Amino acid sequence: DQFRVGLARLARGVRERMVMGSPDTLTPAKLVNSRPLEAALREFFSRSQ
């Protein structure tokens, strides 16, 4: 579940980043993020009740 919503935060990290730019140099290599997802799931395993 936390993966679902966290990866949705990452989805924000995708759809928003891919239009500020130039479609010329483009690939999920530069379009994919970590911290939204990795830190969401990092958050579930500790601060949660």
């Binding site: 130039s22 010329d24 140099t25 690939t27 290599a29």
Partner: protein, 158 residues
């Protein structure tokens, strides 16, 4: 046009070697693609066989076209915008197109600036991008490791 084992570059990402024709399901009836591979990064690529030459999938410089590029480095130059914004823009653009002559030229005037007046922390990043891509295709054409290519570029200057 592109045969199975044609060694060609697929910009901007960098050099690599293609592999072959495939049918990948896209939209309606499957259209032929060039599976194209790359050396270091492990990811595949599919380039439309429709117009691969106009889509930015191009050939690789022959082993004989190296000296024109090295010369476009040592003495090579080109006009650049005044405002730092537009300058960065154009640098990014030439770093997009993949045109080897163009990129070599840009790297030429930029490098010419780094050794004379100075270079910002932006224009220099793009400059190194150019030198690296150059190292890639000069390594691919001349069948040498990146060391000897970058050493050809260091031969241009010192």
């Amino acid at each position: 046009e592109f045969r199975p084992g044609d060694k060609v570059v697929l910009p901007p990402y960098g050099v690599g070697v293609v592999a072959g024709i495939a049918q990948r399901s896209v939209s309606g009836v499957s259209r032929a693609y060039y599976q194209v591979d790359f050396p270091g990064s492990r990811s595949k690529a599919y380039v439309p066989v429709e117009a691969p030459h106009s889509v930015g999938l191009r050939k690789a410089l022959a082993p004989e076209e190296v000296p024109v590029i090295l010369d476009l480095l040592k003495n090579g130059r080109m006009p650049l915008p005044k405002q730092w914004a537009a300058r960065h823009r154009k640098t990014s653009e030439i770093l997009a197109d993949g045109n080897p002559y163009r990129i070599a030229q840009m790297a030429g005037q930029l490098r010419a600036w780094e050794v004379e007046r100075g270079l910002p922390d932006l224009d220099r990043q793009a400059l190194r991008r150019a030198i690296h891509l150059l190292a890639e295709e000069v390594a691919q054409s001349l069948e040498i490791t990146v060391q000897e290519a970058k050493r050809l570029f260091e031969e241009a200057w010192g």
